[PDB]
Amino acid sequence: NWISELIDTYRNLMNNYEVDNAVSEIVSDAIVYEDDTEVVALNLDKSKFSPKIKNMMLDEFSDVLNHLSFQRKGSDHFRRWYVDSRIFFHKIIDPKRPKEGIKELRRLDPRQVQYVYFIYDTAHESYACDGRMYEAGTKIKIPKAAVVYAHSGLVDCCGKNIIGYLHRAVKPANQLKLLEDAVVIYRITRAPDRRVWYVDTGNMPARKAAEHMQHVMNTMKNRVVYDASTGKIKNQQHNMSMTEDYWLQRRDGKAVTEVDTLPGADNTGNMEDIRWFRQALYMALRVPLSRIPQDQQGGVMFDSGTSITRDELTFAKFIRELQHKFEEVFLDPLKTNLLLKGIITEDEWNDEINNIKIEFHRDSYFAELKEAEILERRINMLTMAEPFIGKYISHRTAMKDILQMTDEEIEQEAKQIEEESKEARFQD
Amino acid sequence: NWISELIDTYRNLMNNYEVDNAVSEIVSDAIVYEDDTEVVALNLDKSKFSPKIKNMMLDEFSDVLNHLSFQRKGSDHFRRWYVDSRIFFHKIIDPKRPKEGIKELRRLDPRQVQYVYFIYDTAHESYACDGRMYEAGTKIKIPKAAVVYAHSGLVDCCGKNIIGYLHRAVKPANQLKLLEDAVVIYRITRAPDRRVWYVDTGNMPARKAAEHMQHVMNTMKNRVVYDASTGKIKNQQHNMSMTEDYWLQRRDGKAVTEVDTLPGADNTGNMEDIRWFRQALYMALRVPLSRIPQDQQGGVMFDSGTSITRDELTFAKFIRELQHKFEEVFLDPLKTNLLLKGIITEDEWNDEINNIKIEFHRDSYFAELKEAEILERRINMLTMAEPFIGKYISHRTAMKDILQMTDEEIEQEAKQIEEESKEARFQD
Amino acid sequence: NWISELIDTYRNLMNNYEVDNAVSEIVSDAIVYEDDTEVVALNLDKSKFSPKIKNMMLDEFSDVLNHLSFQRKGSDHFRRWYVDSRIFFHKIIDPKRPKEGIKELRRLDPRQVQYVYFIYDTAHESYACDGRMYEAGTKIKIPKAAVVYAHSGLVDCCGKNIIGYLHRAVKPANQLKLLEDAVVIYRITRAPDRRVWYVDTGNMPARKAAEHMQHVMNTMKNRVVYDASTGKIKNQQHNMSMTEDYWLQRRDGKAVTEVDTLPGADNTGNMEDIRWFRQALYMALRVPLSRIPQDQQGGVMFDSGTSITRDELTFAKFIRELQHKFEEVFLDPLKTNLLLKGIITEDEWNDEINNIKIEFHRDSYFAELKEAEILERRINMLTMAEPFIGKYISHRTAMKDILQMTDEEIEQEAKQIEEESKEARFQD
């Protein structure tokens, strides 16, 4: 239940704006679709028994994505993992025969699952599984296999509870807005001039004294209105009074009946205040500040090509750490399906990972725009430390520590470059 | 009903300005008509049985656009999808014979449709379908086929409800204007000087005391007016009094009758306030801030050709994600018409998508102006790392990682470039 | 117990943001995963009996990481060491036979361990060890071997107690926030204009005097509201009153009934105050200030490649000192397993360390970007002091004190560079 109230407030963090902008900053590059290029490949770079089995996984893996319908439904499944604070896929298998094998993976609403042996609470009717039939309103129990349970790997203030990654920004977000209601509340109110009219009546009953109040309304009450639909001043057509005229009569021989205007909202503020808490909520999100929240006029800095800051570089790391947590949602539908189906056993799997890397695709554009500053500097070094490359540092030695190549890259290239010189078209 | 009240407030978000400017920012490039060039092509880049069937779709697809009348009615159907939060096209088929096949797709008003099996509520009389005749005022039921239902793929605060994409900006928009009425309300009011005239009368009945009030009006009341039609001061022709003169008589021997001017609207503000909430509503829209809301005098930054920022680059991604949601409105009138008509069955279709890409056309101008900075930098690298292209990195190796070409592009070109040299006109 | 309350407040330092940002600044580079490259290698650069035993450790050490599951669970085990202020791994061995040898290392919750002979307090049921069975709710005692106990090597104010490294920043952090509640508390309150209405009633019982108060509410009470869900003004549709009108009646012939508005929150501040304490908490963390907390517009400074400051250089030192404290968590599961298993005895081990260095991997990117300024300056010297290299300083002499090489590097290179000149491709 406490688990369930938590995934509420996270999802009412997304409801608000900016949090939505910054969270979908991440999911926009924590799994980035590109044209032609694929997302979430199964890099196999480890000792495997057959050249056929290592490629056989594609029959398994390029298909296990289909069940998630991952190609058009990925950046929601992940954006759910991250913001939900948990994500459960129920697994239908099989019912028979074994090694058929398996069936569609259906997402489960977090907040309807308890884990002490998974207790799926059912709101309304969701599914009939293999058998016997669709349960209704009852807590159905599913074993800790096979259900993929991927959690944001966070301990929390007191062990052991699951939290994040939005948590650290919940308190900050609740008090950035607690200013935006304050800043409009100050201005809305007092926007209209208010006036308190004190008129006195001594020694007359409230029954008939109020009659001396019914007369100062029906004679001097103001109907002037401003409507936000069309900005016109209703019941005042046409033109505007150059000036007003209110007429009060202090019945006694003393100055007690008067209008005292209540204060106008003088704008002393001076508002560097909210501008403080917005930079907070933004640091608390985990999104780099170099995304442009500020107007950032010009300046410019300046440079023709924006460089890799350490900010942005950090964040790629935060991401590629995420992807390695959401890595889970691929490896336990696969491994239980690659055991259900046959081939490799569990006792063989243990040694392979180790490394059976799942490569997410990065953004094609900033792979280049990063690898262009790396290579820009390595050539700038190399031109600079060039007249000495004959005299002090070998050619091989610079090529491998100024260019940061490796040996078999120089080997491969040295052989290759021979035919370039045979003969056209670069012979000058 | 709640669904229907929602699509109301979205459409009363468009009513306002800026929201209109920013929403039609999107639809201006989420489907961009250009001259000569076509919009919404059916890219077929997958294994298909016949060279004739893959081109046969044009008889199907270049015609399925006609039913939407998409060529002159596209940027409204989409601008409706996006802002409506839903979009339904009823499908007329057939009534007979099968594979005729089909008929015009008629848009349905959202807010008159309920989905639990589609319940089309009818306001007035809309259509007679194939049979039997035009229903009037009654909830007619249409099966979940065949009606194309395209929704903005959003879960909302509580599952499962449909929202967006305008939602996040609804609250912000309602309180940017709640300031613009405040800022005029402060100024309209008090624009005219108001004066409260206290004149006293002790120990005379209100019946005859009011007669001592009828005399201070008919002698000193001001008729001076300013009319907004023509800015002249009515009943004051010609010239303007150099100064005024009001005459009051404190009947008692004490200072109780007087004019107290009510405060003037002193402009202390100091208005960096609304300028806050307009930058909000604008971030909440999803339109990049680099569109020029600000005056942006000069500066300049400066550069002769405006570069691709990361802002703008992000947004192209947000768009091409939309287009892939509005992709739906093409593939289920087509697939149900490509099964109605014959040829490919449903069991064959499942493997094709996968990929049967629907290419929207981008803006011709900024394809270039982007592909000009990419290529500007790749040549700038290539000139810079040129003296080493003989010595360290092969020609092939640079051509494929400094220019980012591919092999069959170099293959194709190497063969091609031979005849350029045979012989004119570039031989110098 | 005091030990246990301490590890509470540290973990409620992490709960807060920024502390989380700065602590994971460290762990992001106190153990940095990289692709392909490994983390935590066992550098053996000392006299060892066999060429086989020195590599035999990998069977031992590349496996002792597996028990920690260090490859995907490292930057949590360390981030726990640092923030917890202690970290205990219980060691399961064996139960028989000896030299089997050993079993999984299970993390222990700090706050449930007392050391005077380790007293593991058990909350609920955690493990059954080899025998006899899982204890419940009782203080089980484990000998000071074998349990790895790694502490942040800090003495504290009074010897001998364990503290840090977060301690110095606890007081500062508790009073940066004691301002952020102050700064919103000032603004929240008074955000709404408050008015105190004094109305008088002399010589009437409180039983019936309150009836003269029930009437000024039900006639003049204001229901105008602003709701933060949707920013609209509830019960006020449509448009906004241009102005207000409140009507009070001083029953006596004297000015005693009136509205006195309570002060508005004038924003004199002038807030360079919190901006003070945030720079404190940030210096107290130990994270360099050159990470970009400030907006840091432009300027720029300027340079195309950001240099190694002395700040950043210091911090690498603070880190590599940490890693040498967390070095412990590798060497006592290894040495007790390399004695349990056999081979080297304790009397042999004493001489080896000395040096049996455990190399953490640094960040691949800033090894380069540091080693590029070092080498940039050594060449800049060398070009500058070049015409004299024939006349005054030898070639050997400059090569070894301008380039900072060593002899066997020049030896090795001089031999190598001969074949470069035999003959292609650099012969110009």
Swiss-Prot record, chains A, B, C:
Its main location: virion. Residues 398-428 form a coiled coil. The keyword Transport does not apply. It is found in: Virion; Host cell inner membrane. Residues 412-428 are annotated as: Disordered. The keyword Membrane applies. GO terms for biological process: symbiont genome ejection through host cell envelope, contractile tail mechanism; viral genome packaging; viral release from host cell. Keywords: Capsid protein, Coiled coil, Host cell inner membrane, Host cell membrane, Host membrane, Membrane, Viral capsid assembly, Viral contractile tail ejection system, Viral genome ejection through host cell envelope, Viral genome packaging, Viral penetration into host cytoplasm, Viral release from host cell, Virion, Virus entry into host cell. It comes from the Viruses. Forms the portal vertex of the capsid. This portal plays critical roles in head assembly, genome packaging, neck/tail attachment, and genome ejection. The portal protein multimerizes as a single ring-shaped homododecamer arranged around a central channel. Binds to the terminase subunits to form the packaging machine. Attaches to the host inner membrane most likely through interaction with host yidC and forms together with chaperone gp40 an initiator complex to form the prohead. Homododecamer. Interacts with the large terminase subunit. Interacts with the major capsid protein. Interacts with the capsid vertex protein. Belongs to the Tevenvirinae portal protein family. This is Portal protein. It comes from Enterobacteria phage T4. The chain holds residues 74 to 516 of 524 of the full protein.
